[PDB]
Design an enzyme around this catalytic site. Sequence first.
Site, PDB file in Angstrom:
ATOM      1  N   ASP A 126       0.816  -1.216   0.000  1.00 18.68           N
ATOM      2  CA  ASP A 126       0.000   0.000   0.000  1.00 18.68           C
ATOM      3  C   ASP A 126       0.861   1.283   0.000  1.00 18.68           C
ATOM      4  O   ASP A 126       0.643   2.183   0.800  1.00 18.68           O
ATOM      5  CB  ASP A 126      -1.047  -0.010   1.134  1.00 18.68           C
ATOM      6  CG  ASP A 126      -2.165   1.017   0.983  1.00 18.68           C
ATOM      7  OD1 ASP A 126      -2.221   1.688  -0.073  1.00 18.68           O
ATOM      8  OD2 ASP A 126      -2.981   1.144   1.912  1.00 18.68           O
ATOM      9  N   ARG A 130      -0.016   9.176   1.751  1.00 14.74           N
ATOM     10  CA  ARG A 130      -0.748   9.104   3.024  1.00 14.74           C
ATOM     11  C   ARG A 130      -0.050   8.188   4.036  1.00 14.74           C
ATOM     12  O   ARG A 130      -0.168   8.427   5.229  1.00 14.74           O
ATOM     13  CB  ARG A 130      -2.207   8.656   2.807  1.00 14.74           C
ATOM     14  CG  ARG A 130      -2.324   7.228   2.276  1.00 14.74           C
ATOM     15  CD  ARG A 130      -3.738   6.753   2.037  1.00 14.74           C
ATOM     16  NE  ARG A 130      -3.715   5.451   1.364  1.00 14.74           N
ATOM     17  CZ  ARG A 130      -3.646   5.294   0.047  1.00 14.74           C
ATOM     18  NH1 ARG A 130      -3.614   6.351  -0.754  1.00 14.74           N
ATOM     19  NH2 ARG A 130      -3.603   4.084  -0.478  1.00 14.74           N
ATOM     20  N   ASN A 131       0.679   7.156   3.548  1.00 13.36           N
ATOM     21  CA  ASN A 131       1.392   6.148   4.340  1.00 13.36           C
ATOM     22  C   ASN A 131       2.871   6.466   4.564  1.00 13.36           C
ATOM     23  O   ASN A 131       3.550   5.707   5.261  1.00 13.36           O
ATOM     24  CB  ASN A 131       1.200   4.742   3.740  1.00 13.36           C
ATOM     25  CG  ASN A 131      -0.254   4.299   3.745  1.00 13.36           C
ATOM     26  OD1 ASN A 131      -1.075   4.747   4.553  1.00 13.36           O
ATOM     27  ND2 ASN A 131      -0.618   3.415   2.840  1.00 13.36           N
ATOM     28  N   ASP A 144       3.884   1.958   7.698  1.00  7.67           N
ATOM     29  CA  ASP A 144       2.772   1.009   7.527  1.00  7.67           C
ATOM     30  C   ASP A 144       3.019  -0.067   6.455  1.00  7.67           C
ATOM     31  O   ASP A 144       2.075  -0.557   5.838  1.00  7.67           O
ATOM     32  CB  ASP A 144       1.451   1.755   7.274  1.00  7.67           C
ATOM     33  CG  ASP A 144       0.980   2.615   8.429  1.00  7.67           C
ATOM     34  OD1 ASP A 144       1.459   2.400   9.570  1.00  7.67           O
ATOM     35  OD2 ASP A 144       0.131   3.498   8.198  1.00  7.67           O
TER      36      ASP A 144
END
Lengths: 261, 93
Positions: A126, A130-131, A144
């Site tokens: 992913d 945002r991560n 993450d």
Amino acid sequence: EIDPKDLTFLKELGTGQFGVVKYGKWRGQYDVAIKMIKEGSMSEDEFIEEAKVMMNLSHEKLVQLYGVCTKQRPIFIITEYMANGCLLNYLREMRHRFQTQQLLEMCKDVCEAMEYLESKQFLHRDLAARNCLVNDQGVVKVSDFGLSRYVLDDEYTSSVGSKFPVRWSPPEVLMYSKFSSKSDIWAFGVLMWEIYSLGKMPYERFTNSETAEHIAQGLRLYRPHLASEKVYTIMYSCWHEKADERPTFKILLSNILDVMD
Amino acid sequence: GSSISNLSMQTHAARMRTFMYWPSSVPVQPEQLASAGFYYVGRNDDVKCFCCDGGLRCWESGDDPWVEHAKWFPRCEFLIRMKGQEFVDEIQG
Ligand SMILES: [Zn+2]
């Protein structure tokens, strides 16, 4: 295994994916981030076992996992404190007035973390702005990594789901759930695009379903205004229809270092 | 002690007209945002409250504009008048 008594809680940071994240102290005066896992959000027994593999991942551009508190509920995830938060919000704050050289180092930082993960045969699954996290010094770090494997929320799991990362997925993931080092390469190209677009949403004028059908017929993200022709060639190489024609993170890193100014 | 930040965005309809070029990628609808006192500033998914000048971005799927308004801007005069103090303290707790 960190003892919860050997931890302090001073300020709340946010309520993103998995639940509440708090700032505090560890051993005595070590700056830490404590991720608290909301009940029923994670395949807990499976995450605890993977955490032991994650503890051994150690890189300068990878968010360091100091330990866990698993002998109580909620499970605490103890990590490196990143004072400037998620990369996406950091990019969207126009006050920063970023130089394109600063945007390139953000790409360099992510590519270095992703080269280390690829050399350990670990997939992010992913990768997106945002991560990624930003520390006090402006350094960007991958966070993450591999966590989507333990998310129980049906909206994030299904490819046609409400929270699936459609805009960061290659054609083979959307169509056949074909995950590989090449699906991490694709997402990296999208992340490079997000950085040079200052946090703009990829394919903003399309829904998730429209994005999925257009990329399958060859539609690609346009050259961001801040991206030079040489920088665009790098992110563009991540989006080849054929997975084997996409570079590794080792090739991409040499390509990024080649255009450093 | 100014009460309103944007007088031209006081009516629900005026806030609705700003959402003309609202990106289809945003998982929140203009009607829900306009009702909660928000108008589109024209960039990405950035909205601003006409009363408290509170700005909100990076909207996620399932986001209730009224909940977010009370979460990040609890002192908003418009929010207290429409939802009551009980609703605000509930989100802060
Ligand atoms: Zn307001």
